Amino acid sequence: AGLLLGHGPIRMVLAILAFLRFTAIKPSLGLINRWGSVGKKEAMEIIKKFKKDLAAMLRIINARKEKKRR
Amino acid sequence: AGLLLGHGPIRMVLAILAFLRFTAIKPSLGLINRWGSVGKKEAMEIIKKFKKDLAAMLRIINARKEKKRR
């Protein structure tokens, strides 16, 4: 259970990395050591889908306060 | 200490959200409840810088295995 042990696949590695990027100033060297172990092809896919989730995230944040329609 | 208590500002909220997006299938409702509390202006800024960090991340992953120069 990657979510439970905090050690998922390379996809979760980048997730934890971004976590430690916006929650911290210095990511843990364990993630950094496994960082270069991420297949850059998968990384390309991850980053693509990541930006897509962020784009949706942004959109929904806007819709959360609905840009004050009312 | 937002990093220690796992409760930083709205910037860290989105960070934890993305974490729970790529590490989990269902984010915790606490984050979801504070999600709409994120200033969508700040969100725009966060998401922008987030994609920038991801772009750099990708680039460095490529440079980690250096696309097999050698």
Side-chain angles (χ1 to χ4, degrees):
Chain A
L3 178 62
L4 181 66
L5 287 306
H7 286 87
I10 53 180
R11 295 178 173 160
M12 281 177 187
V13 178
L14 298 185
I16 303 176
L17 188 79
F19 176 86
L20 298 174
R21 289 299 187 196
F22 280 81
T23 67
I25 302 176
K26 183 65 178 182
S28 311
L29 298 181
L31 285 303
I32 302 299
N33 185 87
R34 191 178 180 201
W35 193 43
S37 184
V38 179
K40 69 193 83 59
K41 177 56 183 301
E42 185 66 54
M44 291 176 181
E45 302 185 76
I46 300 169
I47 297 301
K48 185 186 299 85
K49 296 174 294 187
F50 213 119
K51 295 184 180 181
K52 288 288 275 63
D53 196 284
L54 297 178
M57 185 187 307
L58 176 64
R59 184 179 180 178
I60 308 174
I61 304 290
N62 292 329
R64 288 290 72 214
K65 200 63 179 178
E66 61 189 80
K67 299 180 180 179
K68 195 64 181 301
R69 298 174 306 181
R70 298 166 289 147
Chain B
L3 178 62
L4 181 66
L5 287 306
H7 286 87
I10 53 180
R11 295 179 173 160
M12 281 177 187
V13 178
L14 298 185
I16 303 176
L17 188 79
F19 176 86
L20 298 174
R21 289 298 188 197
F22 280 81
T23 67
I25 302 176
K26 183 65 178 182
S28 310
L29 298 181
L31 285 303
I32 302 299
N33 185 87
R34 190 178 180 201
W35 193 43
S37 184
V38 179
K40 69 193 82 59
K41 177 56 183 301
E42 185 66 56
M44 291 176 180
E45 301 185 71
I46 300 169
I47 297 301
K48 185 186 300 85
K49 296 174 294 187
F50 213 119
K51 295 184 180 181
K52 288 288 275 63
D53 196 286
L54 297 178
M57 185 188 307
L58 176 64
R59 184 179 180 178
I60 308 174
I61 304 290
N62 292 329
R64 288 291 72 214
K65 199 63 179 178
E66 61 189 78
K67 299 180 180 180
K68 195 64 181 300
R69 298 174 306 181
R70 298 166 288 147

